[PDB]
Design an enzyme around this catalytic site. Structure first.
Site, mmCIF file in Angstrom:
data_model
loop_
_atom_site.group_PDB
_atom_site.id
_atom_site.type_symbol
_atom_site.label_atom_id
_atom_site.label_comp_id
_atom_site.label_asym_id
_atom_site.label_seq_id
_atom_site.Cartn_x
_atom_site.Cartn_y
_atom_site.Cartn_z
ATOM 1 N N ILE A 157 58.118 61.403 50.353
ATOM 2 C CA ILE A 157 58.875 62.126 51.377
ATOM 3 C C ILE A 157 60.350 62.019 51.069
ATOM 4 C CG2 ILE A 157 59.579 62.199 53.861
ATOM 5 C CD1 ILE A 157 56.465 63.016 53.088
ATOM 6 N N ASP A 190 63.916 62.050 52.187
ATOM 7 C CA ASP A 190 64.751 61.962 53.374
ATOM 8 C C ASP A 190 65.841 60.934 53.088
ATOM 9 O OD1 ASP A 190 63.454 59.442 53.758
ATOM 10 O OD2 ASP A 190 62.321 60.185 55.503
ATOM 11 N N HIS A 206 66.877 63.083 33.806
ATOM 12 C CA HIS A 206 67.102 62.474 32.511
ATOM 13 C C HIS A 206 67.385 63.484 31.434
ATOM 14 C CE1 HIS A 206 65.649 58.087 32.981
ATOM 15 N NE2 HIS A 206 66.458 58.463 33.953
ATOM 16 N N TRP A 230 61.390 52.486 46.540
ATOM 17 C CA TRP A 230 62.597 52.222 47.307
ATOM 18 C C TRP A 230 62.369 52.388 48.793
ATOM 19 C CZ3 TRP A 230 62.583 54.191 42.425
ATOM 20 C CH2 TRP A 230 63.489 53.655 41.500
ATOM 21 N N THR A 231 61.352 53.190 49.139
ATOM 22 C CA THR A 231 61.112 53.571 50.527
ATOM 23 C C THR A 231 59.641 53.410 50.895
ATOM 24 O OG1 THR A 231 60.803 55.968 50.112
ATOM 25 C CG2 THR A 231 63.087 55.240 50.458
ATOM 26 N N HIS A 239 66.413 58.349 44.619
ATOM 27 C CA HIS A 239 65.469 57.202 44.767
ATOM 28 C C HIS A 239 64.708 57.099 46.099
ATOM 29 C CE1 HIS A 239 67.780 55.061 41.317
ATOM 30 N NE2 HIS A 239 66.812 55.829 40.843
ATOM 31 N N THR A 240 65.051 57.969 47.013
ATOM 32 C CA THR A 240 64.257 58.168 48.212
ATOM 33 C C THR A 240 62.803 58.613 47.899
ATOM 34 O OG1 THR A 240 64.619 58.849 50.547
ATOM 35 C CG2 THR A 240 64.720 60.588 48.834
ATOM 36 N N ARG A 273 62.738 62.773 38.077
ATOM 37 C CA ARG A 273 63.197 61.900 36.979
ATOM 38 C C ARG A 273 63.301 62.649 35.637
ATOM 39 N NH1 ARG A 273 60.080 57.491 33.980
ATOM 40 N NH2 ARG A 273 61.710 56.473 32.715
ATOM 41 N N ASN A 282 57.991 55.615 52.296
ATOM 42 C CA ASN A 282 57.355 56.928 52.185
ATOM 43 C C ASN A 282 57.797 57.606 50.881
ATOM 44 O OD1 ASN A 282 56.050 57.463 55.168
ATOM 45 N ND2 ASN A 282 57.983 56.313 55.341
ATOM 46 N N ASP A 339 71.693 50.224 42.555
ATOM 47 C CA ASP A 339 71.630 50.675 43.952
ATOM 48 C C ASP A 339 72.589 49.823 44.811
ATOM 49 O OD1 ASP A 339 69.394 52.582 43.516
ATOM 50 O OD2 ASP A 339 68.069 50.855 43.676
HETATM 51 C C1 HEM Z 1 72.532 55.854 39.546
HETATM 52 C C2 HEM Z 1 72.029 55.416 38.362
HETATM 53 C C3 HEM Z 1 70.498 55.274 38.194
HETATM 54 C C4 HEM Z 1 69.799 54.266 37.637
HETATM 55 C C5 HEM Z 1 70.338 52.958 37.041
HETATM 56 C C6 HEM Z 1 68.390 54.595 37.736
HETATM 57 C C7 HEM Z 1 67.341 53.815 37.308
HETATM 58 C C8 HEM Z 1 66.017 54.040 37.585
HETATM 59 C C9 HEM Z 1 64.918 53.194 37.201
HETATM 60 C C10 HEM Z 1 65.071 51.873 36.395
HETATM 61 C C11 HEM Z 1 63.802 53.781 37.659
HETATM 62 C C12 HEM Z 1 62.347 53.315 37.498
HETATM 63 C C13 HEM Z 1 61.818 53.732 36.135
HETATM 64 C C14 HEM Z 1 60.404 53.204 36.117
HETATM 65 O O1 HEM Z 1 60.191 51.991 35.911
HETATM 66 O O2 HEM Z 1 59.467 53.981 36.342
HETATM 67 C C15 HEM Z 1 64.125 55.012 38.328
HETATM 68 C C16 HEM Z 1 63.222 55.870 38.932
HETATM 69 C C17 HEM Z 1 63.490 57.082 39.542
HETATM 70 N N1 HEM Z 1 64.707 57.731 39.523
HETATM 71 FE FE1 HEM Z 1 66.543 56.735 38.964
HETATM 72 N N2 HEM Z 1 68.281 55.829 38.333
HETATM 73 C C18 HEM Z 1 69.538 56.280 38.631
HETATM 74 C C19 HEM Z 1 69.824 57.492 39.217
HETATM 75 C C20 HEM Z 1 68.940 58.486 39.536
HETATM 76 C C21 HEM Z 1 69.269 59.869 39.793
HETATM 77 C C22 HEM Z 1 70.713 60.392 39.663
HETATM 78 C C23 HEM Z 1 68.122 60.517 40.109
HETATM 79 C C24 HEM Z 1 67.888 62.011 40.457
HETATM 80 C C25 HEM Z 1 68.671 62.642 41.354
HETATM 81 C C26 HEM Z 1 67.043 59.554 40.062
HETATM 82 C C27 HEM Z 1 65.710 59.808 40.338
HETATM 83 C C28 HEM Z 1 64.653 58.940 40.190
HETATM 84 C C29 HEM Z 1 63.307 59.130 40.696
HETATM 85 C C30 HEM Z 1 62.782 60.329 41.510
HETATM 86 C C31 HEM Z 1 62.528 57.889 40.259
HETATM 87 C C32 HEM Z 1 61.050 57.536 40.503
HETATM 88 C C33 HEM Z 1 60.259 57.920 39.253
HETATM 89 C C34 HEM Z 1 58.784 57.738 39.541
HETATM 90 O O3 HEM Z 1 58.412 57.571 40.746
HETATM 91 O O4 HEM Z 1 57.987 57.786 38.558
HETATM 92 N N3 HEM Z 1 67.584 58.334 39.708
HETATM 93 N N4 HEM Z 1 65.493 55.131 38.273
HETATM 94 K K LIG Z 2 61.186 58.508 51.014
#
Ligand code: HEM
Ligand SMILES: [K+]
EC number: 1.11.1.11
Length: 250
Positions: A185, A187, A42, A179-180, A163-164, A38, A182, A208
């Site tokens: 992990i 995948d 970002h 989202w998952t 989001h995996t 993340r 696991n 999503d």
């Molecule tokens: C497609 C548009 C996207 C939207 C609207 C979006 C939105 C969000 C939101 C609202 C969260 C949760 C924030 C929180 O409350 O902690 C999140 C988490 C996350 N996002 Fe996205 N996201 C997008 C795309 C992406 C992309 C492109 C990536 C990286 C390739 C990504 C990676 C992650 C990861 C790994 C988390 C989990 C963070 C954690 O576990 O603390 N997302 N996203």
């Molecule tokens: K996973």
């Protein structure tokens, strides 16, 4: 490719390899891969191609950019990384955070995203508001990833599979849960779950869901749900591009 990667010295190259290994152990032990992913996403996703502003140039550590509401909670990630970064003073923060993103994918079982050093740290954060809005749909995704960042429709779908790993937090975005099943992990499960509809304990954002109803996004979702190898390939391609926006002649 359209890229010309700068030369960095042998000592810089040594520090990258040493930092990559330190980041593996640290990120694995702290269980913070999704947060680091993340952070890199970002940091990189503020790039605007028409103005060549924003992008993965180390400005995300600025209290000013961390204050952006889309970055709620990323001050944690920055804080976690500061002691390790201090052991590699030769590396730009831009390189360090992008490398941490690459590592986050690797240590969770993900593809090996190619990394090139040379990002220079930039003086001023971009404007707030360039990051995507989880309540919006496919036109918005195309505005953000395509019109601003210059990524493809395939890239949007594969990068969404980011989001995996990990979870939303009601104190950060307001959304809540993984989202998952696991979340540490990497995948193709994100795509499986998205297709199977809602399940207790699992999250799906409107953004999503928008992937299911788009004539172009949907077949990609289907392909990735069916073939993790094809997901890993397209994912590594898209992450590399994202991590390199505005860097090395694109
Ligand atoms: C497609 C548009 C996207 C939207 C609207 C979006 C939105 C969000 C939101 C609202 C969260 C949760 C924030 C929180 O409350 O902690 C999140 C988490 C996350 N996002 Fe996205 N996201 C997008 C795309 C992406 C992309 C492109 C990536 C990286 C390739 C990504 C990676 C992650 C990861 C790994 C988390 C989990 C963070 C954690 O576990 O603390 N997302 N996203
Ligand atoms: K996973």
């Amino acid at each position: 490719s359209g890229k010309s990667y700068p030369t960095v010295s042998a000592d810089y190259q040594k520090a990258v390899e040493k930092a990559k290994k330190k980041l593996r152990g640290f990120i694995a032990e702290k269980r913070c891969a999704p947060l680091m992913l993340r952070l890199a996403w970002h940091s990189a996703g503020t790039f605007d191609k028409g103005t060549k502003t924003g992008g993965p140039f180390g400005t995300i550590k600025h209290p000013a950019e961390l204050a952006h509401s889309a970055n709620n909670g990323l001050d944690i990630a920055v804080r976690l990384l500061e002691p390790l970064k201090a052991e590699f003073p030769i590396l730009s923060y831009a390189d360090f955070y992008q490398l941490a993103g690459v590592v986050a994918v690797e240590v969770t079982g993900g593809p090996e995203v190619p990394f090139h050093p040379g990002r220079e740290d930039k003086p001023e954060p971009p404007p707030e508001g360039r990051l995507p809005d989880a309540t919006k749909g496919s036109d918005h995704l195309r505005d953000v990833f395509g019109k601003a960042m210059g990524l493809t429709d395939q890239d949007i779908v594969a990068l969404s599979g980011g989001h995996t790993i990990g979870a939303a937090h009601k104190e950060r975005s307001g959304f809540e849960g993984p989202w998952t099943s696991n979340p540490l992990i990497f995948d193709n499960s994100y795509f499986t779950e998205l297709l199977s509809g809602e399940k207790e304990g699992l999250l799906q954002l409107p953004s999503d869901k928008a992937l299911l109803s788009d004539p172009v996004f949907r077949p990609l979702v289907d392909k990735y749900a069916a073939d993790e190898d094809a997901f890993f390939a397209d994912y590594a391609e898209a992450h590399q591009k994202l991590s390199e926006l505005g860097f090395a002649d694109a």
